[PDB]
Symmetry: D2
């Protein structure tokens, strides 16, 4: 059931309706690669939901109340006040993905100096690390381990909180590695495993108990803190009558600091946060704020403009609107349910995205011929929809052999920019897939005509086989 919008549309960005012939020529010009298509030629852009969503009236208005002072800005104060009242965290560092490149080395050095952490043995844990989070950890020489539950990636097996930490696994992992060697634990909410799955407050409390016992810093990766709070309100009986705000205040008692991209639930096109709960982490705050300036090995300055901090200060609240969250989540579920109904199969589908199995949809196309990229092109031809391939095309070649890397599955990712498209667009997408599935046998595979040495998915050009 797609819920009606708990809002009145106030500002729109016109998008032209193209003809089939126009799109056919467009996709050829772009070398059968949606990444090379002009935004204006895309009717429904499902490339990413990162900073591509709508803002509320108050959020937009906030952009015109900025204090551009380098220091002591009232706009910075407003943002810090929002964090304090919403998460209960006293220290705020605005960022322009939550400054993972900052807190990671800071936490590693902290434990090395205080508990004799061994850099050659250190391991960080999370219910599920985001790619960049794992990236910065490993770059800093830290091994990572995802301690997710058995039900996490098990489709066809409904579970209210598939993003939960595997409490036993975490405990066993810490003991195995040695508490002095665990620089931090990252609690990702909602979790990025299986398309996006929530984490229960009960699970978070249990995880924090474990972390506290071993005195291990806990960082809440909060890009989708609001949707997680909504899932808790909807599925965790204990919090059924709690407001999203109360659930959020409670949730954050179970972390020592937070790091988040504001480009998701916070509703803004740019910005992030790195915050610390209380004085116990004041030194961590200082170190991070310091490293923020000299991260390059010398002083470098810059930051969000005043208006952007004022906008986020408002966005943090609007992002928690109960009616909004119920609507956003219901729309995503509406799309998935609609696709499942017409026979479209997804390897995984959650709050973050739906990963359609193009291999199953287009079985006649060899993996090396990129069936998911072929599907992306067909979806554009038929409906002007742009989606990203998550398969052999994206995977690329082995840097040491120059040969195509082996890929588990050929998926096509569908993300939904917040408060941007309607139920009618969702039905349009479903009808598009229905048409593709019907004409599947006739979709051709692809082969390169131009291929970069690295990050080929962004600018490579292909032709039909």
């Amino acid at each position: 059931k797609h819920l009606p919008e708990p809002f009145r549309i106030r500002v729109i960005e016109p998008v032209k309706r193209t003809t089939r012939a126009y799109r056919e020529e467009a996709i050829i010009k772009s070398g059968m690669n949606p990444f090379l298509l002009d935004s204006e030629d895309v009717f429904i852009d499902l490339l990413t939901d990162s900073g591509t969503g709508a803002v509320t009236q108050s959020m937009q208005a906030a952009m015109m109340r900025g204090d551009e002072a380098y220091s002591g800005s009232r706009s910075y104060y407003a943002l810090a006040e929002s964090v304090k009242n919403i998460f209960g965290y006293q220290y705020t560092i605005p960022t322009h993905r939550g400054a993972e490149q900052i807190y990671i080395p800071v936490l590693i050095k902290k434990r090395e100096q205080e508990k004799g952490l061994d850099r050659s043995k250190m391991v960080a844990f999370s219910n599920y690390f985001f790619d960049t989070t794992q990236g910065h950890s490993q770059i800093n020489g830290c091994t990572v381990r995802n301690v997710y539950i058995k039900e996490a990636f098990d489709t066809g097996v409904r579970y209210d909180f598939k993003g939960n930490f595997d409490l036993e696994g975490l405990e066993r992992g810490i003991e195995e590695v040695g508490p002095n060697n665990v620089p931090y634990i990252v609690a990702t909410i909602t979790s990025n495993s299986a398309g996006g799955q929530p984490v229960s407050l009960a699970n978070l409390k249990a995880m924090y108990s474990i972390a506290k016992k071993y005195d291990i810093p806990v960082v809440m990766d909060s890009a989708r803190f609001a949707e997680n709070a909504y899932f808790i309100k909807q599925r965790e009986a204990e919090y059924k009558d709690w407001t999203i705000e109360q659930i959020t205040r409670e949730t954050y008692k179970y972390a020592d600091m937070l790091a988040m991209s504001a480009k998701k639930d916070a509703m803004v096109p740019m910005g992030g946060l790195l915050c610390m709960k209380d004085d116990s982490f004041f030194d961590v705050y200082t170190e991070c704020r310091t490293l923020c300036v000299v991260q390059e090995g010398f002083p470098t300055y810059g930051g969000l403009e005043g208006g952007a901090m004022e906008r986020l200060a408002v966005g943090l609240y609007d992002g928690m609107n109960l009616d909004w969250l119920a609507y956003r989540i219901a729309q995503v579920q509406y799309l998935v349910d609609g696709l499942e109904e017409i026979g479209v199969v997804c390897q995984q589908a959650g709050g973050h995205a739906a990963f359609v199995d193009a291999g199953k949809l287009l079985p006649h196309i060899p993996a090396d011929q990129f069936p998911a990229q072929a599907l992306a092109c067909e979806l554009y031809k038929v409906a002007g929809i742009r989606a990203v391939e998550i398969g052999s095309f994206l995977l690329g070649r082995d840097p040491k052999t120059g040969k195509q890397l082996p890929c588990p599955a050929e998926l096509l990712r569908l993300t939904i920019p917040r408060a941007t498209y309607t139920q009618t667009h969702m039905d349009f997408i479903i009808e598009a897939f229905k048409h593709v599935k019907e004409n599947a046998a006739n979709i051709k595979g692809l082969t390169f005509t131009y291929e970069p040495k690295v990050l080929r998915h962004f600018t490579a050009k292909l032709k039909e086989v």
Copy 2:
């Protein structure tokens, strides 16, 4: 078929989802009168589409480029340039409903001085006068006549252009009254007859031929000039492949000047226009521009702020977007069709609004007990929808007898703010009526508890019988 939005939502105004109990208390506090309800307590506000619609990104941005100079403003120039390029009219007077209070007395005096028009015999014609247009005409001592076609108000009899002028009637009326006594003819597009019906270009050309033959000024009442152009493109074969812009340029060759509220098709919350095609009406321009200043009997100044003129300068173009018009019109038709399907009957329904027959829907309620007002309250209770009664409640009492005035039908008006609500909201409205029709027998009539002497519909309070 509800078309998908030819745009991405960019800015939203949050609206809270209320409980049935909350609305029940709300409607009682407002004395069973939606006019007294707080806007925040209304989920779907169908009160009016006048200046309540969304704006495009470019239109909003324009508000920040204003030149506030009293005279010679580049913002005024930009607006005049838009009028010249869109309608082909060389003279523009921005207004803050198209200054009917200005051109009417000006045109009357013009013909009185030039052709000996007799004020005691003068009569003005239109395919259908808007209420305020008829109001200003009559206040100026001018009688009005609507020369609409037979098919105009005939439901159950599809006709492509029900707003057409009755060419024979117009001709006969002019001859009857005497050409020297006809100060002007107003071509309303789209026409306000039967809920809003289009006027064909063929019909407009024919009407202008008649007017020109008798040298009678023709004023194009243009609040919905774009939707009319769209209907011409959709239904008048000759213009099937013409752009909305070309149809508009052609359409305006068949009027000498134009008057319009910009609060409809032009997409803005305020403003209007009074324009003249060429030098042949330069003296009419001068007189109007002059009367604009001394309309009160002495000089009075003021006008749209610069940003507002820049916004309208853009709005005139965005309002003609083909995809937008097709979408707007399809949504309105979608609502009407959906209501017809569930057994809801409308006395008239067109592009402007749908007039539900509350008397037929709630036959047990006596007219004097306001069945349409009762229906308005029930619609709010059940779905938080606000609609206006067009019946005995609005009609009021006879100023000379203090008795209720007799009313032809008890109607409930449904209007749709542009680019504000979605197909999901439309379905919500339809489901609401479905529920009401199902529980019709139990809806009670109303009686006053407080009643003003004039304009009672705005602040009167009632209770159930």
Copy 3:
């Protein structure tokens, strides 16, 4: 002493610097009439300060938080709340000059029905009526009388409150006319007499005492309520340590309602207010709100857009900023003092404007040759400054004889848009006059080449003699 700006400039409107040759050609193209010059060709536009000033960040931001609902708008509520907290008035009617055309007929009818007011004998009083206020009064058949003090127009005789009511005169006038025949008294603050002069709170209390004794409605014409409050704080010892807000709350206890153009002290480009203090004037509120709809003799709708009401709701407060008022007033006084220093003489100069005596500055030019218009053109040629003539040119011809009307003095008006120009611009203006005074003897008189029958000053074209 020009005070430094109590603010940081945040948004600017570029204005091109023209050459002398360019302006020489420009003024000729405009027929030696600044009113016909393009705004872009004017470097410093002193035409009017009405709605031509800057806005604060919060005021601008407010424009994006509008609730466009026809009724029950939260934006209307916000504006009404501002009025209640600032003036203490419970009833608010937003207008789009304070709806003088509304309260005047309403107050006249009120006293006619309640106290037997005789329309053939009625007379309204004010410390000084604004032109439009006097206009609407007289149009309604009501005679007006300005009861200003002796020192009001006496230059060379400093007096702290030259805008004061002549308390004795008011008393004597009421008795003479008969209290039943005085429909209302208008307290104009600041007063428009002698270029703008303040009214003391002591004087207002005394006037209200008189009005209350006779039960005569008192309307506060409040376009410049804030500057008056500032003058009271600066010159009335009793209120030296009172805030502008406290002075305003106190001031408004001495009126029954208020009417104001928001285009002055309220800092906005459009809008006004008509408000009533308490229930004692609830019927006056109802009548006005009612007449607002049917003022034309039938229902007509429209109003400020939501954003505009939100903006004014903020503007009413920002307009009272103490540092801002001190700065605005000091700048005006700085210009006048600077002109006086170089030998330029003004017939009158106050907070509203400075009226330079062009006749004295250019004694060789006959009045019929418009020395003030000649001066306006010269000021533009030399510095790109645009100012309005208040003399024989503006006065026009006698409608009954077609002959030039006799004029007391040939003045050139200088107004200063709020927060728009700097001390450097003020010095630029002073230097311009210094240059003109130096080359006075060579400035030529003007004669028509094109002259409209009415309101000739706006579009007439002239040439040098």
Copy 4:
């Protein structure tokens, strides 16, 4: 001579006027450190001109026309089009300081692979490297050399282009180091040497000739490209009648690519650019665009919001406005001249900033007691001005000895945010220094009460001695 503003102020940010007692308490609360003062408590904030200036109406409006698409954004296209038409560069990479961290390693590797550049011998040249530019170069293991002219830092010796490259020195340096070992040459305009000094087009052409001869990449560090163009128009006879735009197009023929922070001349609060002229540097473009994504050692995404790119697309043009540049530069020169007149001495003063010698102004205060920080506090106490110390306080302690580092001079930096303050503020600053110089002997030195281990200037607290 302070020029009048070539613009009308449209939006202001109110700033409160504080009392001496208030500021005295404020500076004590902030531990005698302006960096710890609330922005609201600072009347005139001269901390930095980086992203603290005003924007034009069109620039602000642009923020509401953003296309947030991840790729193919029309907003990105608009920005790239501006770069192409203004600089003639075909390739644009928007950045969120011009991505020095990107082009430096890219250019180093390019020459290492193509000409056998030796990383242990590489040296980069510039007329004067900005601190961060030198920082990234050295971090990449590249030694830097500033080849400025003899007259560069020689005060009391006027020279039109003190930012010029020492052509002979550059030639000799390249030969000495070996052309294969010079990865790039950076042309900084205007140059950051001696407070900001321009570079002539003749000098740039000569430098490019040298670079081209040796096939060495030339990067134009363009934060202040417009002011440099203005100085060329004002001082280089050959370009006297050329427009700023023509001078800019010509100037950029003498570089292969450009890198710039848009937070200066480009008038925006955030953003930068890294651009390449033509196909000869297409591979450099690709490499940079690629490294932009994987700079962290793995893919990371993000970028300027659509509105920000639209704003910069406009800002690049508005920043070149001739009247604006003349005004901006004249104001800076007005401040310096005014200070020189009252006996205040600056070690260096140019277009970027003025460096007051606090040691000379307060000779009784020992360097270790921070006379420039003492001066900063006194300036705040007396006038509410905030300025940054560039002396022993900023220099800090030797990381290897913990002892105060030796400092050449105790300077206080004065920067001027663009289009933010007026001539009256400039006079206010001058009067403030006049007062300080008069009460110099009584100003006390400072000593720590709290001192961080690193970057102490930002949060250290001190007390008077």
